[PDB]
Design a binder for these strands. Sequence first.
RNA 1: GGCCAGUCUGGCGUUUGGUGACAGCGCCAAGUUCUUCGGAAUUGGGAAAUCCUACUGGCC
Length: 89
Amino acid sequence: PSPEIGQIVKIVKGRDRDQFSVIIKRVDDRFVYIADGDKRKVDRAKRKNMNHLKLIDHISPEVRHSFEETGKVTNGKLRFALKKFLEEH
RNA sequence: GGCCAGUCUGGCGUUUGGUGACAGCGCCAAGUUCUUCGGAAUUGGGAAAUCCUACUGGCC
């Protein structure tokens, strides 16, 4: 399954390993860009090979709706999506 | 299995760079070489290669 915009991931490789992040842009089949709105904010999002992430079965509608209407997402909305995701699991 | 590119002594920490193995930075250790004894250089294996072990990324 292709990675989705607004989907939560767990980082499995790299120095940001074992953290949770949000997919904010899909380059192709291989590469995405992730950001958490805190230590890794949108304006310097982290490029990632999708093989170095673990797809979590959770997609935040707030993140993907904001990209559909404004073409962007705020760091506060990213922090909200991750904070809400952790509270349900 | 083939072709190409890359990484290297170990432990803890890390808002930094890298897709990544890793690296950078702080601290504690280890090996090798040199020393005027104050220190200095260096770090997978190999005498060395377009070589090889392990690991990472790409194409098949």
